Design a protein around this ligand. Structure first.
Ligand SMILES: CCCCCCCCCCCCCCCCCC(=O)O
Ligand SMILES: [Ca+2]
Length: 450
């Protein structure tokens, strides 16, 4: 009611998915869910044309390093041909539109802006580009990004920094700077404690709760989007939603919702009910099955990542998807917007455990701290029917925020997945063992277990 809209800007290879839990937290504290907005943009182009400096002569050395490897030298020519100033103006005008719509919709005169990682560079340039744009910002929140520069003039800014070893000397001048040395890069963005500090910083009081509070009623409104990983463009395809049982078995002959999707979609589902989101993206025979915990309240920020050029990470698994053994094994992708760490460290204070059919794939070698694993690929490397966990899957060592585990997952019956979080608590799933020749399985773990 007496709240301002907040607009979040993600980092490189990120999306609104990183603010999904904070959105639910804002709503559980009285914000109308619609007052929390996200701005999505193409991070590969932004980084290559605008943040070149951060990319190679600074912060994001990791993506910079494997830019030449992950992208077609010709394709990179096209992106690098693009004009910097044109790109900036066109992207800033689009953000101006999101902000203005948020202002009209709430009657508020200003909004709060929040950036994470590259998003902080983005927002600082944005607020500094014109007096007209800054006048509409009540508070600026910079999460684990830019340091060593001035906070925009006259804009209350708060910079929050996490543990540096995830590749207190980080200060934004004139901003309130605080630190959470117990947190990793993405975790800092989705964490309930970052939520309490952001909330307090913009509202002047500690929120009553930091939990994702189950709302009353049988239904939840879900607004989501199937988009390209990293470039974030709309993806078209067909979506079938099926309520499922404790073992992943479809409870209905026909899907409870079937629809053509061109990016965003909105649907009404049951609160606390497990669901399988099956998707077929235009021009691909593969059937995707996305699984995640039940929705306990409205979620207007759900994201289903799809692999597409020029950064088709999924092709790295094609050799195995094409082998005859592929009819015999499953291939899955585990995602958590909170680094899965298999390397013990005191400051971070804990190791996660991730079991697939009883085997722990979050090892020191597979999931070292420096890897900041948010996406773990589990499949039979080489299609040789052997689970060589101690042999690194080299092809993924080049992808940012990812890793892989050579594990044989028989395509018969079900697959059980169990995670024990480094911050405590456990979550598990049991889903069908779809074969890798025609199916792809994606399982997203919640980024916080209370
Ligand atoms: C099916 C293919 C989809 C690809 C799956 C990859 C999933 C991995 C999750 C990525 C986590 C987002 C990282 C956000 C950090 C941003 C860094 C920056 O801002 O510079
Ligand atoms: Ca193997």
């Amino acid at each position: 009611e007496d709240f301002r809209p907040v607009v979040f800007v993600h980092g490189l290879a990120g999306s609104a998915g990183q603010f999904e839990s904070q959105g639910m937290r804002f709503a559980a504290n009285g914000y109308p869910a619609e007052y929390v907005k996200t701005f999505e943009y193409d991070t590969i182009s932004w980084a290559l044309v605008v943040e070149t400096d951060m990319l190679f002569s600074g912060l994001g050395s990791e993506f910079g390093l494997n830019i030449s490897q992950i992208i077609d030298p010709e394709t990179l020519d096209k992106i690098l041909s693009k004009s910097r100033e044109r790109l900036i103006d066109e992207t800033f005008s689009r953000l101006d539109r999101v902000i203005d719509e948020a202002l009209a919709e709430s009657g508020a005169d200003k909004v709060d802006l929040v950036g994470h990682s590259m998003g902080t560079f983005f927002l600082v340039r944005y607020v500094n580009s014109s007096p007209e744009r800054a006048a509409k910002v009540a508070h600026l929140i910079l999460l684990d990004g830019v340091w060593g520069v001035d906070a925009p003039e006259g804009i209350p800014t708060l910079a929050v920094f996490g543990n540096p070893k995830a590749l207190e000397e980080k200060v934004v001048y004139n901003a309130t700077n605080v630190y959470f040395n117990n947190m990793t890069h993405v975790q800092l963005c989705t964490s309930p404690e970052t939520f309490a500090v952001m909330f307090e910083f913009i509202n002047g009081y500690k929120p009553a709760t930091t939990d994702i509070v189950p709302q009353d009623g049988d239904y939840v409104k879900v607004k989501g989007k199937f988009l390209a990983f990293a470039t974030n463009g709309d993806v078209s395809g067909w979506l079938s939603i099926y309520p499922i049982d404790e073992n992943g078995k479809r409870l209905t002959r026909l899907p409870v919702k079937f629809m053509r999707v061109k990016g965003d979609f909105e649907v009404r589902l049951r609160k606390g009910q497990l669901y399988e989101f099956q998707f077929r993206k235009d021009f691909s025979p593969i059937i995707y099955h996305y699984y995640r915990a039940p929705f306990v309240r409205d979620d207007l920020w759900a994201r289903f990542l799809v692999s597409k050029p020029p950064l088709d990470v999924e092709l790295l698994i094609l050799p195995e998807r094409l082998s005859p053994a592929a009819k015999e094994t499953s291939g899955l992708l585990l995602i958590r917007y909170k680094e899965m760490i298999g390397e013990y460290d005191e400051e971070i204070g804990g190791v996660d455990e991730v079991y697939v059919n009883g085997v722990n794939v979050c090892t020191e070698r597979i999931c070292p701290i420096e890897r900041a694993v948010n996406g773990l690929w589990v499949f039979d490397r080489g299609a040789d029917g052997k689970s060589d966990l101690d042999r690194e899957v080299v092809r993924y060592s080049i992808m940012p925020f990812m890793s892989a585990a050579d594990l044989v997952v028989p395509a018969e019956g079900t697959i059980s997945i169990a995670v024990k979080s480094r911050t405590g608590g456990e979550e598990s799933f049991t889903i069908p063992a779809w074969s890798a020749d025609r199916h792809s399985i994606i399982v997203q773990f919640s980024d916080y277990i209370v």
